[PDB]
């Protein structure tokens, strides 16, 4: 079985490259971030523009939703993260402490902590309510490209240009495991699978890899796309067929069969690198976003 | 940021 994703909407408004797109957990919204320093909120099903959220002084690399869809956190080159109330658009807290660009961020499932990663090679854990830093982890020896909590919040996975993937104990900040492969190419993205048993990691040698966390072993590799330059997000698609989804530096969205590793669809339409993709939590809908020549977000829908 | 090489 292959999906049949087709273009339904194109979302214009950002004035520089889009850096990330994420669907709200309640499915109603898409949030986008951009090098233009702005966050924009859109309707997930019709692409209707809702509002612009502003406050960062430099471009934004990442945005993430809280579990209840009420808050966003953003990570900026201005060396801060900001927590936003989506309804009011107000900045609730500014998280200060990183000494260089903040590249990635996420809430835990409880949504009382935020994890961030930075060009300063550290991973920080922040209290959502106070906005203060709880722990600083000397996680890596090069910029940190992604950070993600597992399903019960007890673990954090981080990735870095140093070629390593590390798994951290949230409560203590101590390292539980280091994953290394081949000739340690930069790891540009990492996240836990929905059941927290696997880790999906992108490296800048045109390769995605699925790891068994408990055994520390590679189980699947996904190839065929172009990824040698940018930190491109990847996703598990779980609403219909079980796919792996990723953008690509040849301007396409790639979709693989998770078990067989075969490419099942390539979505054509963007006119620049597809830096970010997101999968809707209940519908067979993908959002994709592209760099400077394109600057748009596209919504695609499939029957399965 | 992420949008730059």
From Swiss-Prot, chain A:
Q: Where are the WD repeats?
A: 13-52, 55-96, 98-138, 139-178, 182-223, 226-266, 269-303
Q: Where in the cell is it found?
A: Nucleus
State the InterPro entries in the record.
Answer: G-protein_beta_WD-40_rep, WD40/YVTN_repeat-like_dom_sf, WD40_repeat_CS, WD40_repeat_dom_sf, WD40_rpt
Q: Which GO terms describe its biological process?
A: gluconeogenesis; negative regulation of transcription by RNA polymerase II; positive regulation of DNA-templated transcription; positive regulation of gluconeogenesis; regulation of cell cycle; regulation of cell division; regulation of DNA-templated transcription; regulation of embryonic development
Among the Pfam families in the record, one is Beta-prop_WDR5
The UniProt keywords, alphabetically, are: Acetylation, Chromatin regulator, Host-virus interaction, Isopeptide bond, Nucleus, Repeat, Transcription, Transcription regulation, Ubl conjugation, WD repeat
A single GO CC term for this protein reads: ATAC complex
Superkingdom of source: Eukaryota
**Site (Important for interaction with histone H3) location in chain:** 77, 103, 233, 292
Position(s), cross-link Glycyl lysine isopeptide (Lys-Gly) (interchain with G-Cter in SUMO2): 16
- PROSITE patterns in alphabetical order: WD_REPEATS_1, WD_REPEATS_2, WD_REPEATS_REGION
Q: Which SUPFAM superfamilies match?
A: WD40 repeat-like (SSF50978)
Q: What Gene Ontology molecular function terms does this protein carry?
A: histone binding; histone H3K4 methyltransferase activity; histone H3K4me1 reader activity; histone H3Q5ser reader activity
Task: Give the sites modified to N6-acetyllysine.
Answer: 82
Instruction: Tell me what effect the entry lists for residue 17 to E.
Output: Strongly reduced affinity for histone H3
Q: What is the effect of changing residue 233 to A?
A: Strongly reduced affinity for histone H3. Significant decrease in interaction with KMT2A
Effect ascribed to mutating residue 210 to K: Loss of interaction with RBBP5 and reduced ability to stimulate KMT2A methyltransferase activity in association with RBBP5 and ASH2L
Q: State where it is primarily located.
A: nucleus
Kindly list the residue ranges recorded as spanning the membrane. none
Role played: Contributes to histone modification. May position the N-terminus of histone H3 for efficient trimethylation at 'Lys-4'. As part of the MLL1/MLL complex it is involved in methylation and dimethylation at 'Lys-4' of histone H3. H3 'Lys-4' methylation represents a specific tag for epigenetic transcriptional activation. As part of the NSL complex it may be involved in acetylation of nucleosomal histone H4 on several lysine residues. May regulate osteoblasts differentiation.
| Record text on subunit structure and interactions | Interacts with PAXBP1; the interaction is direct and links a WDR5-containing histone methyltransferase complex to PAX7 and PAX3. Interacts with HCFC1. Component of the ATAC complex, a complex with histone acetyltransferase activity on histones H3 and H4. Component of the SET1 complex, at least composed of the catalytic subunit (SETD1A or SETD1B), WDR5, WDR82, RBBP5, ASH2L/ASH2, CXXC1/CFP1, HCFC1 and DPY30. Core component of several methyltransferase-containing complexes including MLL1/MLL, MLL2/3 (also named ASCOM complex) and MLL4/WBP7. (Microbial infection) Interacts with herpes virus 8/HHV-8 protein LANA1; this interaction regulates the MLL1 histone methyltransferase activity on viral DNA.
Question: What protein family does this chain belong to?
Answer: Belongs to the WD repeat WDR5/wds family.
Q: What is this protein called?
A: WD repeat-containing protein 5
């Amino acid at each position: 079985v292959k999906p049949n994703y087709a273009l339904k909407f194109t979302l214009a408004g950002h004035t520089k490259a889009v850096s990330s797109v994420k669907f709200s957990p309640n499915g109603e919204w898409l949030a986008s971030s951009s090098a233009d320093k702005l966050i924009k909120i859109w309707g997930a099903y019709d692409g209707k523009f809702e509002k612009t959220i502003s406050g960062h002084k430099l471009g934004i690399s990442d945005v993430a939703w809280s579990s209840d869809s009420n808050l966003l956190v953003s990570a900026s080159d201005d060396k801060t993260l900001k927590i936003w109330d989506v309804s009011s658009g107000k900045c609730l807290k500014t998280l200060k402490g990183h000494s260089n660009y903040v590249f990635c961020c996420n809430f835990n499932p409880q949504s009382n902590l935020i994890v961030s990663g930075s060009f300063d090679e550290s991973v920080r854990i922040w209290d959502v309510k106070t906005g203060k830093c709880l722990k600083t982890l000397p996680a890596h020896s090069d910029p940190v490209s992604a950070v993600h909590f597992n399903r019960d919040g007890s673990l954090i996975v981080s990735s870095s240009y140093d070629g390593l993937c590390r798994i951290w104990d949230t409560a203590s900040g101590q390292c539980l495991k280091t994953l290394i492969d081949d000739d340690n190419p930069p790891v540009s993205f990492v996240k836990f699978s929905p059941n927290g048993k696997y880790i999906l990691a992108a490296t800048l040698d045109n390769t995605l890899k699925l790891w068994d966390y408990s055994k520390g072993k590679c189980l699947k590799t996904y190839t065929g796309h172009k990824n040698e330059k940018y930190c491109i997000f990847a996703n598990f698609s779980v609403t219909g067929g079980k796919w792996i989804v990723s953008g690509s530096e040849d301007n396409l969205v790639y979709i693989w069969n998770l078990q067989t590793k075969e490419i099942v669809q390539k979505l054509q339409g963007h006119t620049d690198v597809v830096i970010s993709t997101a999968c809707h939590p209940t519908e067979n809908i993908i959002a994709s976003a592209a760099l400077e020549n394109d600057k748009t977000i596209k919504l695609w829908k499939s029957d399965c | 940021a992420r949008t730059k090489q």
